[PDB]
Amino acid sequence: MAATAAEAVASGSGEPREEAGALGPAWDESQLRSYSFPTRPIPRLSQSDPRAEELIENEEPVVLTDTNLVYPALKWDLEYLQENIGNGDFSVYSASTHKFLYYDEKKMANFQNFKPRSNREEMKFHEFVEKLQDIQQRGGEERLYLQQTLNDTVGRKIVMDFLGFNWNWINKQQGKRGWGQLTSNLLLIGMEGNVTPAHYDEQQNFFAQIKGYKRCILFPPDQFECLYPYPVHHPCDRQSQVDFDNPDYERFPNFQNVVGYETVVGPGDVLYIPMYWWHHIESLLNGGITITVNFWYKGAPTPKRIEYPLKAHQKVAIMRNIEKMLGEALGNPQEVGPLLNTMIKGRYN
Amino acid sequence: MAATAAEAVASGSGEPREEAGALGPAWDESQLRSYSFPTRPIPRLSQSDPRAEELIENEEPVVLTDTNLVYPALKWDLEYLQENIGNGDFSVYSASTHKFLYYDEKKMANFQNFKPRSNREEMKFHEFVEKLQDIQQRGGEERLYLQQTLNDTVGRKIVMDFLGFNWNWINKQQGKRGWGQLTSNLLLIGMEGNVTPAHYDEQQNFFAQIKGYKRCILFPPDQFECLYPYPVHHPCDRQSQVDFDNPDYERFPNFQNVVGYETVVGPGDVLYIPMYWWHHIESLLNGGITITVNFWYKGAPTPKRIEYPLKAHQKVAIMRNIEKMLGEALGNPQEVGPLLNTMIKGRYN
Numbered sequence: 187m188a189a190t191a192a193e194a195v196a197s198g199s200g201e202p203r204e205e206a207g208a209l210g211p212a213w214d215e216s217q218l219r220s221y222s223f224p225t226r227p228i229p230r231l232s233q234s235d236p237r238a239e240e241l242i243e244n245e246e247p248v249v250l251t252d253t254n255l256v257y258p259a260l261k262w263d264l265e266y267l268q269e270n271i272g273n274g275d276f277s278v279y280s281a282s283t284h285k286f287l288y289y290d291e292k293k294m295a296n297f298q299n300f301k302p303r304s305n306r307e308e309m310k311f312h313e314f315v316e317k318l319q320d321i322q323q324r325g326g327e328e329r330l331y332l333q334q335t336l337n338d339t340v341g342r343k344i345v346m347d348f349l350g351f352n353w354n355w356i357n358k359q360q361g362k363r364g365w366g367q368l369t370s371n372l373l374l375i376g377m378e379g380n381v382t383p384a385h386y387d388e389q390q391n392f393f394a395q396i397k398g399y400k401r402c403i404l405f406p407p408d409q410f411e412c413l414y415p416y417p418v419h420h421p422c423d424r425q426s427q428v429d430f431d432n433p434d435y436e437r438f439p440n441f442q443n444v445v446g447y448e449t450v451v452g453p454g455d456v457l458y459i460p461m462y463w464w465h466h467i468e469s470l471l472n473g474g475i476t477i478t479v480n481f482w483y484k485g486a487p488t489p490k491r492i493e494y495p496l497k498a499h500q501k502v503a504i505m506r507n508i509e510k511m512l513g514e515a516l517g518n519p520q521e522v523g524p525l526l527n528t529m530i531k532g533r534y535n
Numbered sequence: 536m537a538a539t540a541a542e543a544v545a546s547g548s549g550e551p552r553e554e555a556g557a558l559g560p561a562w563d564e565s566q567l568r569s570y571s572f573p574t575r576p577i578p579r580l581s582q583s584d585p586r587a588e589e590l591i592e593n594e595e596p597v598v599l600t601d602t603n604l605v606y607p608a609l610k611w612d613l614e615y616l617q618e619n620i621g622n623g624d625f626s627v628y629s630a631s632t633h634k635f636l637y638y639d640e641k642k643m644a645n646f647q648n649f650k651p652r653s654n655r656e657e658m659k660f661h662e663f664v665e666k667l668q669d670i671q672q673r674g675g676e677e678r679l680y681l682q683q684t685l686n687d688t689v690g691r692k693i694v695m696d697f698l699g700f701n702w703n704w705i706n707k708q709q710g711k712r713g714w715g716q717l718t719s720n721l722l723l724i725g726m727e728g729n730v731t732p733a734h735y736d737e738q739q740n741f742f743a744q745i746k747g748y749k750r751c752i753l754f755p756p757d758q759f760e761c762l763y764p765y766p767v768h769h770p771c772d773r774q775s776q777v778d779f780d781n782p783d784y785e786r787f788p789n790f791q792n793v794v795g796y797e798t799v800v801g802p803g804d805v806l807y808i809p810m811y812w813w814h815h816i817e818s819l820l821n822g823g824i825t826i827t828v829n830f831w832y833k834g835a836p837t838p839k840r841i842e843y844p845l846k847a848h849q850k851v852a853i854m855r856n857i858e859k860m861l862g863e864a865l866g867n868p869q870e871v872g873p874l875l876n877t878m879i880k881g882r883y884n
């Protein structure tokens with residue numbers, strides 16, 4: 187039966203890997219949250235494996251196990267970073283829930299009836315370690331998540347490690363894919379259980395895991411109709427409106443047909459998250475703090491000639507463009523919805 | 536009660552006018568078809584009346600009773616035209632119903648599952664008079680409607696009358712409104728009872744009545760949501776999908792809120808039909824053949840600066856543009872609908 191076969195290939199992250207030296211299972215199923223949709227595993231390969239180069243070339247996710255991309259950072263931890271990252275400001279988000287929904291502050295002007303579930307708070311690294319230390323011993327329920335792009339104000343040793351990254355490998359990837367420039371490197375340090383809701387980015391991304399384990403659930407661009415992203419002008423643009431913990435099938439019927447690709451990444455693994463691919467990221471339950479550094483690259487330039495059929499991500503690009511134009515033409519983003527409905531009601535639906 | 540007051544101002548074409556010389560009522564209520572919506576009267580004024588100049592300036596319909604625009608043509612009739620219009624080809628549409636829905640043949644390629652309710656048949660004027668004579672005596676049910684733009688192949692006397700038109704008046708109108716060039720002059724000769732379904736044009740129009748009487752029902756551009764025009768790429772683009780004789784309130788709920796402006800025009804009257812205004816035109820029942828000549832003018836150029844709020848017709852222009860672009864981008868007009876739905880479902884509705 188194809189039914190049974192389907193219930194099998196939907197193995198998710200599969201059997202937990204064993205850490206060398208018989209140090210036991212990296213993690214166990216109970217550390218993963220439970221969702222209503224099925225998921226197939228993302229291929230875990232060697233960077234020397236042609237299949238991996240094949241997946242990246244075809245804009246498909248793949249976990250590279252031996253790139254040594256951020257090898258020098260694998261020694262990183264709270265103590266080390268505090269004594270070497272510098273005294274610059276670090277964006278720290280606090281929240282009353284395990285979900286850290288991303289919001290664009292420049293767009294909070296278009297929607298005043300919008301209040302974020304998490305607030306940003308700038309501070310020095312030692313302060314973050316402090317606020318965190320407080321909560322851990324105070325037994326608080328508050329959750330924190332540090333997300334700061336690595337700037338030119340970081341300490342000497344941190345700059346040293348940075349230089350030790352495997353630029354030879356990634357620079358060749360950048361070149362072979364025709365991608366644009368490296369736009370930034372985001373350092374992420376979250377508490378166990380933390381979750382970054384499903385969303386997509388308009389950048390190519392090499393997601394390098396350093397400390398702790400993270401479960402990454404991706405969805406191809408062609409599942410746009412099942413994930414219902416917020417309006418382009420809304421502050422939560424590119425994020426999914428669907429609450430994965432309590433799906434509202436009445437407002438989002440097609441979320442019942444969603445099928446993901448998941449995997450659990452650990453120290454040393456690099457996950458290629460293709461541009462426009464949706465991704466849900468959560469730090470395993472009771473797994474301790476997690477550390478990650480991403481590498482965002484501008485996508486390759488759109489080809490002078492346009493071949494048909496268009497790819498899923500090209501249609502997503504068109505929809506985004508329409509929403510943006512209409513917002514400018516109407517002189518007000520709030521009127522985008524009414525005009526769109528007027529356009530389709532009784533005409534295209 | 537505002538209810539009663541509303542039921543009063545909704546007088547439609549009002550009391551039938553009396554023809555000079557005590558020749559009786561021009562027409563009577565029983566010659567008008569019955570519809571499910573209410574209608575207020577269009578102002579019937581003198582071209583010297585400032586109020587008329589006011590309405591035209593504000594892009595609002597008005598019937599001018601004394602322009603003498605097509606004074607020389609008032610003598611026109613089948614016999615005269617046959618002996619003077621020439622031997623060029625005249626587009627003649629035949630149909631099994633009283634409704635002559637307009638269709639764009641260049642767009643019949645995008646929709647193959649579309650078959651017009653009326654067919655075009657080129658012929659010489661004398662042939663049209665023939666086919667018509669046949670039906671009238673044969674007691675046939677077939678209906679004909681001649682619609683041919685006046686070209687440079689018309690007879691001498693017809694050209695004479697043409698020259699006698701009141702160009703002094705209309706040329707000043709064209710100049711005062713900043714309108715573009717005169718694009719064409721359509722000659723319409725239909726059988727009693729004929730109907731041109733509700734639709735709008737992207738041209739300014741001076742509709743000059745010559746023979747017989749016509750009931751014209753207009754709807755302002757802001758009633759777009761109540762009239763459900765076909766998709767822009769469909770051959771019936773700009774026409775209403777709503778069957779005025781048997782409205783489908785299930786597919787077109789807002790047609791229940793539609794409110795029109797009507798009037799009955801006769802020999803000598805000129806009806807200004809502003810650009811984008813919907814219009815329904817029917818030749819009175821048992822009123823004999825009708826003759827009309829319109830004057831289509833390119834609208835004025837869009838102002839360099841755009842003031843807000845936009846006017847209803849500007850939003851209609853934006854919607855049309857979106858449909859067109861999307862059709863080009865997707866490489867196929869048939870995919871416009873699916874993409875639009877994907878865009879709004881669970882996001883803007």
Ligand SMILES: O=C(O)CC[C@@H](O)C(=O)O
Pocket residue numbers: 374381382387391393467478480
């Ligand atoms: O690790 C996370 O919490 C999410 C990061 C992800 O959105 C990215 O683009 O790197």
Ligand SMILES: O=C(O)CC[C@@H](O)C(=O)O
Pocket residue numbers: 723730731736740742816827829
């Ligand atoms: O007279 C008619 O049948 C309709 C003509 C009208 O659509 C016009 O644009 O002049």
Ligand SMILES: [Fe+2]
Pocket residue numbers: 385386387465
């Ligand atoms: Fe992301």
Ligand SMILES: [Fe+2]
Pocket residue numbers: 734735736814
């Ligand atoms: Fe028309």
